[PDB]
Amino acid sequence: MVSHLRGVMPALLTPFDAQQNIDRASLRRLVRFNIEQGVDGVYVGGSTGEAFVQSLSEREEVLEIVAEEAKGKITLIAHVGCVSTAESQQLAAAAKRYGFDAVSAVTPFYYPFSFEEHCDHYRAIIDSADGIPMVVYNIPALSGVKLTLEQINQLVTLPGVGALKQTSGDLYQMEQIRRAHPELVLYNGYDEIFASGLLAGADGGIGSTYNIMAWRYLGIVQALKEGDTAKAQQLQHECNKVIDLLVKVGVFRGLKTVLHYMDVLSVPLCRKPFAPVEDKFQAELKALAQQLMQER
Amino acid sequence: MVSHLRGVMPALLTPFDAQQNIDRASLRRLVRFNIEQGVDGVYVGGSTGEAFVQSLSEREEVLEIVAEEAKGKITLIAHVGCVSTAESQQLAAAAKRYGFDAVSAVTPFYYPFSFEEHCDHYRAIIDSADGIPMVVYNIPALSGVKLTLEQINQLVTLPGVGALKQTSGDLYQMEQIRRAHPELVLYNGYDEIFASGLLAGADGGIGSTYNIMAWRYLGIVQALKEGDTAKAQQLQHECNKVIDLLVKVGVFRGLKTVLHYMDVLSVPLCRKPFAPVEDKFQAELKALAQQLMQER
Amino acid sequence: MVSHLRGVMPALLTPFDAQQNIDRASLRRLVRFNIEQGVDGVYVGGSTGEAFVQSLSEREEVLEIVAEEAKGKITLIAHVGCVSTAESQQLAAAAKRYGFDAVSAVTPFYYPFSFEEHCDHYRAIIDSADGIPMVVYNIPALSGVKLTLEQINQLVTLPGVGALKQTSGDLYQMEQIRRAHPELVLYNGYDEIFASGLLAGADGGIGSTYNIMAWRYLGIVQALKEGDTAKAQQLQHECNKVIDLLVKVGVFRGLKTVLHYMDVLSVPLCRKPFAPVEDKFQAELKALAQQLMQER
Amino acid sequence: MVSHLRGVMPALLTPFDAQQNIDRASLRRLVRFNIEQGVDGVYVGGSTGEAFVQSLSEREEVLEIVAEEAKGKITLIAHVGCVSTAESQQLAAAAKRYGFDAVSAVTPFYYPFSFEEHCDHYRAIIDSADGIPMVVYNIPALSGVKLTLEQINQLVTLPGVGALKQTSGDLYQMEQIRRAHPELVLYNGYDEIFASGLLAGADGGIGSTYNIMAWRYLGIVQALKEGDTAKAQQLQHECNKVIDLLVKVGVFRGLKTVLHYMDVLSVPLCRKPFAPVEDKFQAELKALAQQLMQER
Ligand SMILES: [Cl-]
Ligand SMILES: [Cl-]
Ligand SMILES: [Cl-]
Ligand SMILES: [Cl-]
Ligand SMILES: [Cl-]
Ligand SMILES: [Cl-]
Ligand SMILES: [Cl-]
Ligand SMILES: [Cl-]
Ligand code: NA
Ligand code: NA
Ligand code: NA
Ligand code: NA
């Protein structure tokens, strides 16, 4: 009863203005741009949205704006996760008020928590979400949390959990999760292995690079559905040429810079301590924006 | 010109009341209790203070209260670190207003930052600290940040840096830091190796377990100064028997529970997602409080 | 000019008798069994062959026996790798004498070696191989060696290197290697991600579980060639149900036990310190052998 | 009843000649040199002895030569460890024949073994050692084996185990081991933390750098016994200046080069794939040899 959550959803970036304040006008334009890429949903306030250098009120502000542009048109998922359970609950209650279709929360980090503490954290947020489903979000590389398969199985069967965001490159585990849970909504988290992650059992994806080239990932979905192995590989090749460059320049600010050159974002800054893009990369990023716009 | 920062300083816990709100009365009593243990300073708003499940305004509130009880009596160090540079600067400016003697900031975490981004982060906070010195705080285990010796050397020679909080069990690196920087204020971060860390080159310590037994760590300092090898080892043995138990029960909540049984804190709760202490451990923690009070 | 090395090749197990001596008769039967599975080659004396609990003379003995059964019928690859360069060269010269088509060597382990020391190690073995090509074998999980993409690129372009055995679950790196080297023979090393690894750029595989079910992996190759996405996934599912069980029971001894129940190996023991299979797993392993024999 | 195993023992290097063959004459001179440094024992055939690039017969040859020079004069410990249990047993039986006072074995590596497989491995070697005690050797950094405290406790209480070689920088665990086992012979393994490791509970050490400056480590033992904190720290400082240089140049070959400049070893080569020392380091290593000889 949550199959409406399956698909390809950009992890929304949060545009900032020249003084590191939220750029509300560019945020609305980014939502509209992603809708017009034909995505299945948007994922708001995640790591990629620079949530962990924003206050709670800033995160709520972003959630409400995105709901204003996109409620009813595409699926809306609110990443409400903080280290604090009480802070996460406040964002879940807000997401509910604004009409989101699901909430999500990263495994709480920095401090070591027991597995039962993780489960109670999710249970508390689910209660505050007041009837909209929860997406468990697994990103061991950044969170430092290293869950076992059996712990993942317990999380995805918690009452109120409707999906798993699997930000892991271990595609044995992806296949095991799919085999244990054939109906589970299972998002591939690393864009650079999207085609292989779908083959291993994911049925969708949440990704930062979908903000600039969602049609490629939709094309990978279509290629594997149609049985065009070689087209899925060629599309993944092109995605990874782009990801190579983004890793070199810095991923969030590279994506925001490409979006600026596509006339989507007025100002491409990340918040400190992220530095601005080095001048020597600007030509490459502008050429990529031009390439991507022509490819459409 | 910052030798006044050397010594043994508890990493202050933040007392909460039964509804997870700050317990201001127990906070003031905890400051007074630590002063009367004869410590050299207190370290406020660190990891141990549960900073990362508090808002900025809550952290400022704690800083100002502690300064009200302790300014002028002992050294005050404010941990102002957040992921965000701008948030860290706000806390540094506040710490300056409240009369702290130093600020400190954990290496920003969750997101990968370049080393130069780390340095600019520290430079920005130092500027907002408006003339009080900075303590670099290294805790690779929890931050995920794995600095090299040469990067540590560049951080401790940044203008405005007066100390290093070395929360690392690598005592080769402790000795290398001391040999490269003979005048550096160098805090041992892991209480469970305090005696060995002093021998390897630290000249003080910042520790969570000093809140319940600072006299033991002061006694280790005195033993090594006097050349009583065996007394330093026996004191460290007793500290580690306590740390063994705290790890079993959960360190912050175990410390708060011992302080409650010493009539220092009215309520020993941590914030969610930390669970309360299991009932089966209460007898041991109360017996430890009684042991520690008699030992004084 | 080494496209004849592409394909699906079992990592041969080394059968031992009841007293931990090589079982020469069961070895010959295992080679013949693998040939009659329609594999493209066999990979002899690797990790899976328990090379690192055998002497050099025992490894040479196995190489020569396998060449006697299989030279001319299928591709033969000799894993000659040791920590010692001189020991590896002896095995390479032997493999050449016995008529192998390629040699392979794991990155030397236990001791830390510089990257240039690794390259000179490969260069020395290539020289002793006396004109047959080298397969670089990357297994960071077991070797502790963590090569970068640029170092991999330098290894696969060493004169005399004809292939890379990529025993890594990082399928971003698999795709990068393929994109940098479109003609490279690129073996997937983890059987549990075979379908996804082929999609990411591998054009074959070397695997321990091919000894008991090579037709499934050949079927995955055929399915992806034909564009039958769902059949590749179903075959991988069945492989991983088997791999799940093998991990539970111990992989090498589980494989040898299944082969014993298929009447291929007389005795299914590994060498100490590998323990024998626990009695409680025997029913499951015998049922799997019966299932696999009927499936053919 | 194994207190005769406590103390400071060099991890003997194995001298090779110009063609990578064992240099028997320089081996005997190295044993004699170490005896005349006043060490408590010698540790033969360990990692430092380049055991894992030698055959079994080469290791036996080294064991027997060292016993010929040193049996009866100082304690002799034979590192018999291999991955194979049967190979380790052969070396243990040989060590017994040659009159060694103890055997030692690294936790078997490369392949994952269960803890019970590790214990049975030690039990088998102890049986072949035929009444001389076993030293468990823990070096997680190089072995990849990450034992828990409770597993260490089970190993050191196996019948026939008389000591633990603790090659770990975790001095919390060192203290826990000492507190659990007050009579255990407990060797510090990382020379660069020797003083701190003794303070944390070790009562001796086995180290590669003792081959060139054992008197410094004996002086650290004496300083801590006498209560001269500052002298132990100054000696450790000087040791670590040397270790810094050895890490830069390559530790085994740097040590052998210093010994060559002290007229102990005729030829300072390691076996391939270890490269020779770079020419640019020779001046520093010769100056260190001259410094060390004058310091005596
Ligand atoms: Cl936040
Ligand atoms: Cl973190
Ligand atoms: Cl905070
Ligand atoms: Cl945070
Ligand atoms: Cl071997
Ligand atoms: Cl290893
Ligand atoms: Cl050996
Ligand atoms: Cl080996
Ligand atoms: Na949708
Ligand atoms: Na003070
Ligand atoms: Na072939
Ligand atoms: Na002795």
Side-chain angles (χ1 to χ4, degrees), chain B residues 28-64:
Chain B
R28 293 176 180 277
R29 184 158 171 75
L30 180 56
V31 175
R32 289 236 44 78
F33 177 83
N34 274 313
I35 289 166
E36 294 171 9
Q37 289 195 89
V39 300
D40 298 299
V42 66
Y43 187 86
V44 190
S47 323
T48 302
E50 284 173 79
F52 303 116
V53 290
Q54 290 171 67
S55 65
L56 294 189
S57 56
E58 285 171 341
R59 287 175 71 172
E60 291 178 351
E61 174 179 12
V62 169
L63 291 180
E64 190 164 24

CSV table of all heavy atoms in Angstrom, one decimal, chain B residues 28-64:
chain,number,residue,atom,x,y,z
B,28,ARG,N,24.1,24.3,37.8
B,28,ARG,CA,24.9,25.1,38.6
B,28,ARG,C,25.5,24.3,39.7
B,28,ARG,O,26.7,24.5,40.1
B,28,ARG,CB,24.0,26.2,39.2
B,28,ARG,CG,23.6,27.2,38.2
B,28,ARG,CD,22.6,28.3,38.8
B,28,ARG,NE,22.2,29.2,37.9
B,28,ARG,CZ,22.8,30.3,37.5
B,28,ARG,NH1,24.1,30.5,37.9
B,28,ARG,NH2,22.3,31.2,36.7
B,29,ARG,N,24.8,23.3,40.3
B,29,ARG,CA,25.4,22.5,41.3
B,29,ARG,C,26.5,21.6,40.8
B,29,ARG,O,27.5,21.4,41.5
B,29,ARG,CB,24.3,21.6,42.0
B,29,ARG,CG,24.8,20.8,43.1
B,29,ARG,CD,23.7,20.3,44.1
B,29,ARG,NE,24.2,19.4,45.1
B,29,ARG,CZ,25.0,19.7,46.1
B,29,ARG,NH1,25.3,20.9,46.4
B,29,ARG,NH2,25.5,18.7,46.8
B,30,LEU,N,26.4,21.2,39.6
B,30,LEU,CA,27.5,20.4,39.0
B,30,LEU,C,28.7,21.2,38.8
B,30,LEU,O,29.9,20.8,39.0
B,30,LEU,CB,27.0,19.8,37.6
B,30,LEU,CG,28.1,19.0,36.9
B,30,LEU,CD1,28.6,17.8,37.8
B,30,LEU,CD2,27.5,18.4,35.6
B,31,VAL,N,28.6,22.5,38.3
B,31,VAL,CA,29.7,23.4,38.2
B,31,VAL,C,30.4,23.5,39.5
B,31,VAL,O,31.6,23.5,39.7
B,31,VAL,CB,29.3,24.7,37.6
B,31,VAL,CG1,30.5,25.7,37.6
B,31,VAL,CG2,28.8,24.6,36.2
B,32,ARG,N,29.6,23.8,40.6
B,32,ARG,CA,30.2,24.0,41.9
B,32,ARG,C,30.9,22.8,42.4
B,32,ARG,O,31.9,22.9,43.1
B,32,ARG,CB,29.1,24.5,42.9
B,32,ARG,CG,28.6,25.9,42.6
B,32,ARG,CD,28.7,26.7,43.9
B,32,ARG,NE,30.0,26.5,44.5
B,32,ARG,CZ,31.1,27.0,44.1
B,32,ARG,NH1,31.2,27.9,43.1
B,32,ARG,NH2,32.3,26.7,44.8
B,33,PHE,N,30.3,21.6,42.2
B,33,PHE,CA,30.9,20.4,42.6
B,33,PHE,C,32.2,20.2,41.9
B,33,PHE,O,33.2,19.8,42.6
B,33,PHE,CB,29.9,19.2,42.2
B,33,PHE,CG,30.5,17.8,42.6
B,33,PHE,CD1,30.4,17.3,43.8
B,33,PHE,CD2,31.1,17.1,41.6
B,33,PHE,CE1,30.9,16.1,44.1
B,33,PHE,CE2,31.6,15.8,41.8
B,33,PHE,CZ,31.5,15.3,43.1
B,34,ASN,N,32.3,20.4,40.6
B,34,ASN,CA,33.6,20.3,40.0
B,34,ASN,C,34.6,21.3,40.4
B,34,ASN,O,35.8,20.9,40.6
B,34,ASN,CB,33.4,20.4,38.5
B,34,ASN,CG,33.0,19.1,37.8
B,34,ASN,OD1,33.6,18.1,38.1
B,34,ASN,ND2,32.0,19.1,37.0
B,35,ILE,N,34.2,22.5,40.7
B,35,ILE,CA,35.2,23.5,41.3
B,35,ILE,C,35.7,23.0,42.6
B,35,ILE,O,36.9,23.1,42.8
B,35,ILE,CB,34.5,24.9,41.5
B,35,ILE,CG1,34.2,25.5,40.1
B,35,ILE,CG2,35.4,25.7,42.3
B,35,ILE,CD1,33.3,26.7,40.2
B,36,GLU,N,34.9,22.4,43.4
B,36,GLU,CA,35.3,21.9,44.8
B,36,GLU,C,36.1,20.6,44.7
B,36,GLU,O,36.5,20.2,45.7
B,36,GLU,CB,34.1,21.8,45.7
B,36,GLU,CG,33.4,23.3,45.9
B,36,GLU,CD,32.1,23.3,46.6
B,36,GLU,OE1,31.6,22.2,47.1
B,36,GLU,OE2,31.5,24.4,46.7
B,37,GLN,N,36.2,20.0,43.5
B,37,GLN,CA,37.1,18.9,43.3
B,37,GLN,C,38.5,19.4,43.1
B,37,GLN,O,39.4,18.5,43.0
B,37,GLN,CB,36.7,18.0,42.1
B,37,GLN,CG,35.4,17.2,42.3
B,37,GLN,CD,35.3,16.1,41.2
B,37,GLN,OE1,35.8,15.0,41.4
B,37,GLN,NE2,34.7,16.5,40.1
B,38,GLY,N,38.7,20.7,42.9
B,38,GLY,CA,40.1,21.2,42.7
B,38,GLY,C,40.5,21.1,41.3
B,38,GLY,O,41.8,21.1,41.0
B,39,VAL,N,39.6,21.0,40.3
B,39,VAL,CA,40.0,21.0,38.9
B,39,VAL,C,40.6,22.3,38.4
B,39,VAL,O,40.4,23.4,39.1
B,39,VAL,CB,38.8,20.5,38.0
B,39,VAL,CG1,38.3,19.1,38.5
B,39,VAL,CG2,37.7,21.6,38.1
B,40,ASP,N,41.3,22.3,37.3
B,40,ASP,CA,41.9,23.5,36.8
B,40,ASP,C,41.0,24.3,35.9
B,40,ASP,O,41.3,25.5,35.6
B,40,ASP,CB,43.2,23.1,36.0
B,40,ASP,CG,44.2,22.4,36.9
B,40,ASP,OD1,44.7,23.0,37.8
B,40,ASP,OD2,44.5,21.2,36.6
B,41,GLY,N,39.9,23.7,35.4
B,41,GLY,CA,39.0,24.4,34.5
B,41,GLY,C,37.9,23.4,34.3
B,41,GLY,O,37.8,22.3,34.8
B,42,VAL,N,36.9,24.0,33.5
B,42,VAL,CA,35.8,23.1,33.0
B,42,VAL,C,35.6,23.4,31.5
B,42,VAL,O,35.9,24.5,31.0
B,42,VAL,CB,34.5,23.4,33.8
B,42,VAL,CG1,34.0,24.9,33.5
B,42,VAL,CG2,33.5,22.4,33.4
B,43,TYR,N,35.2,22.3,30.8
B,43,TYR,CA,35.1,22.3,29.4
B,43,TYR,C,33.6,22.1,29.1
B,43,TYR,O,33.0,21.1,29.4
B,43,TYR,CB,35.9,21.2,28.8
B,43,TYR,CG,36.0,21.1,27.3
B,43,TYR,CD1,37.0,21.8,26.6
B,43,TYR,CD2,35.2,20.3,26.5
B,43,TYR,CE1,37.1,21.8,25.2
B,43,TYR,CE2,35.3,20.2,25.2
B,43,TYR,CZ,36.2,20.9,24.5
B,43,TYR,OH,36.3,20.8,23.2
B,44,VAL,N,33.0,23.1,28.5
B,44,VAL,CA,31.5,23.3,28.4
B,44,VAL,C,31.0,23.1,27.0
B,44,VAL,O,31.6,23.7,26.1
B,44,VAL,CB,31.1,24.6,29.0
B,44,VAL,CG1,29.6,24.7,29.2
B,44,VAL,CG2,31.8,25.0,30.3
B,45,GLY,N,29.9,22.4,26.9
B,45,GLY,CA,29.3,22.3,25.6
B,45,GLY,C,30.0,21.3,24.6
B,45,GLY,O,29.7,21.4,23.4
B,46,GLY,N,30.8,20.4,25.1
B,46,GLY,CA,31.4,19.4,24.2
B,46,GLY,C,30.5,18.3,23.9
B,46,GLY,O,29.3,18.3,24.2
B,47,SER,N,31.1,17.3,23.2
B,47,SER,CA,30.4,16.0,22.9
B,47,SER,C,29.7,15.5,24.2
B,47,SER,O,28.5,15.2,24.2
B,47,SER,CB,31.3,14.9,22.4
B,47,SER,OG,32.3,15.4,21.5
B,48,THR,N,30.5,15.5,25.3
B,48,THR,CA,30.0,15.0,26.6
B,48,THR,C,28.9,15.8,27.1
B,48,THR,O,28.0,15.2,27.8
B,48,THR,CB,31.2,15.0,27.6
B,48,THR,OG1,32.3,14.2,27.1
B,48,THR,CG2,30.8,14.5,29.0
B,49,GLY,N,28.8,17.1,26.8
B,49,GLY,CA,27.7,17.9,27.2
B,49,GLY,C,26.5,17.7,26.4
B,49,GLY,O,25.5,18.5,26.5
B,50,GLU,N,26.5,16.7,25.5
B,50,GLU,CA,25.3,16.4,24.6
B,50,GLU,C,25.0,17.6,23.7
B,50,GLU,O,23.9,17.8,23.4
B,50,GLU,CB,24.1,15.9,25.4
B,50,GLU,CG,24.2,14.5,25.9
B,50,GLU,CD,23.1,14.0,26.9
B,50,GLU,OE1,22.0,13.7,26.4
B,50,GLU,OE2,23.4,14.0,28.1
B,51,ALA,N,26.1,18.3,23.3
B,51,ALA,CA,25.9,19.4,22.4
B,51,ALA,C,25.1,19.1,21.2
B,51,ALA,O,24.3,19.9,20.7
B,51,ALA,CB,27.3,20.0,22.0
B,52,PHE,N,25.3,17.9,20.6
B,52,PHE,CA,24.8,17.7,19.3
B,52,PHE,C,23.3,17.2,19.3
B,52,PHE,O,22.8,16.9,18.2
B,52,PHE,CB,25.7,16.7,18.5
B,52,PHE,CG,27.1,17.3,18.4
B,52,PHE,CD1,28.2,16.7,19.0
B,52,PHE,CD2,27.3,18.5,17.8
B,52,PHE,CE1,29.4,17.3,19.0
B,52,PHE,CE2,28.5,19.1,17.7
B,52,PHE,CZ,29.6,18.5,18.3
B,53,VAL,N,22.7,17.2,20.5
B,53,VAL,CA,21.2,17.0,20.6
B,53,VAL,C,20.6,18.3,21.2
B,53,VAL,O,19.5,18.2,21.8
B,53,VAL,CB,20.8,15.7,21.3
B,53,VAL,CG1,21.2,14.5,20.4
B,53,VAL,CG2,21.5,15.6,22.7
B,54,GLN,N,21.4,19.4,21.2
B,54,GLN,CA,20.9,20.7,21.7
B,54,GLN,C,20.9,21.7,20.6
B,54,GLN,O,21.7,21.7,19.6
B,54,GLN,CB,21.8,21.2,22.8
B,54,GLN,CG,21.7,20.5,24.1
B,54,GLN,CD,22.7,20.9,25.1
B,54,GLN,OE1,22.7,22.0,25.6
B,54,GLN,NE2,23.6,20.0,25.5
B,55,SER,N,19.9,22.7,20.7
B,55,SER,CA,19.9,23.8,19.8
B,55,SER,C,21.1,24.8,20.1
B,55,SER,O,21.7,24.7,21.2
B,55,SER,CB,18.6,24.6,19.9
B,55,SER,OG,18.4,25.1,21.2
B,56,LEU,N,21.3,25.8,19.2
B,56,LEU,CA,22.2,26.8,19.5
B,56,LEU,C,21.8,27.6,20.7
B,56,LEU,O,22.6,27.9,21.6
B,56,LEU,CB,22.4,27.8,18.3
B,56,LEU,CG,23.0,27.2,17.0
B,56,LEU,CD1,23.3,28.4,16.0
B,56,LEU,CD2,24.3,26.5,17.3
B,57,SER,N,20.5,28.0,20.8
B,57,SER,CA,20.1,28.8,22.0
B,57,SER,C,20.3,28.0,23.3
B,57,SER,O,20.6,28.6,24.3
B,57,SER,CB,18.7,29.3,21.8
B,57,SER,OG,17.8,28.3,21.6
B,58,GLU,N,20.1,26.7,23.3
B,58,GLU,CA,20.3,25.9,24.4
B,58,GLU,C,21.8,25.8,24.8
B,58,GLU,O,22.1,25.9,26.0
B,58,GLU,CB,19.7,24.4,24.2
B,58,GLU,CG,18.2,24.3,24.3
B,58,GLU,CD,17.7,23.0,23.8
B,58,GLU,OE1,18.4,22.2,23.1
B,58,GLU,OE2,16.5,22.6,24.2
B,59,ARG,N,22.6,25.7,23.8
B,59,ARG,CA,24.1,25.7,24.1
B,59,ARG,C,24.5,27.0,24.7
B,59,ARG,O,25.3,27.1,25.6
B,59,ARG,CB,24.9,25.4,22.8
B,59,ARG,CG,24.7,23.9,22.5
B,59,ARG,CD,25.4,23.5,21.2
B,59,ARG,NE,26.8,23.6,21.2
B,59,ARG,CZ,27.6,23.2,20.3
B,59,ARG,NH1,27.1,22.6,19.2
B,59,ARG,NH2,28.9,23.3,20.4
B,60,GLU,N,24.1,28.2,24.1
B,60,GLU,CA,24.4,29.5,24.7
B,60,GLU,C,23.9,29.6,26.1
B,60,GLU,O,24.6,30.2,26.9
B,60,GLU,CB,23.7,30.6,23.8
B,60,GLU,CG,24.3,30.7,22.4
B,60,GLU,CD,23.6,31.8,21.6
B,60,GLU,OE1,22.6,32.3,22.1
B,60,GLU,OE2,24.2,32.2,20.6
B,61,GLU,N,22.7,29.1,26.4
B,61,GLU,CA,22.1,29.1,27.7
B,61,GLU,C,23.1,28.4,28.7
B,61,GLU,O,23.4,28.9,29.8
B,61,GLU,CB,20.7,28.5,27.7
B,61,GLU,CG,20.1,28.3,29.1
B,61,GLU,CD,18.7,27.7,29.0
B,61,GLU,OE1,18.3,27.2,27.9
B,61,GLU,OE2,18.0,27.7,30.0
B,62,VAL,N,23.6,27.2,28.3
B,62,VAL,CA,24.5,26.5,29.2
B,62,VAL,C,25.8,27.3,29.4
B,62,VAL,O,26.3,27.4,30.5
B,62,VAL,CB,24.7,25.1,28.6
B,62,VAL,CG1,25.9,24.4,29.4
B,62,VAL,CG2,23.5,24.2,28.7
B,63,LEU,N,26.4,27.8,28.3
B,63,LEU,CA,27.6,28.6,28.4
B,63,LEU,C,27.4,29.7,29.4
B,63,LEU,O,28.3,29.9,30.2
B,63,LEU,CB,28.0,29.1,27.0
B,63,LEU,CG,28.5,28.1,26.0
B,63,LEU,CD1,28.8,28.8,24.7
B,63,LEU,CD2,29.7,27.3,26.5
B,64,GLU,N,26.3,30.5,29.3
B,64,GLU,CA,26.2,31.7,30.1
B,64,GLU,C,26.0,31.3,31.6
B,64,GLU,O,26.6,32.0,32.5
B,64,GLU,CB,25.0,32.5,29.6
B,64,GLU,CG,25.0,33.9,30.3
B,64,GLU,CD,24.1,34.9,29.7
B,64,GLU,OE1,23.2,34.5,28.9
B,64,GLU,OE2,24.3,36.1,29.9
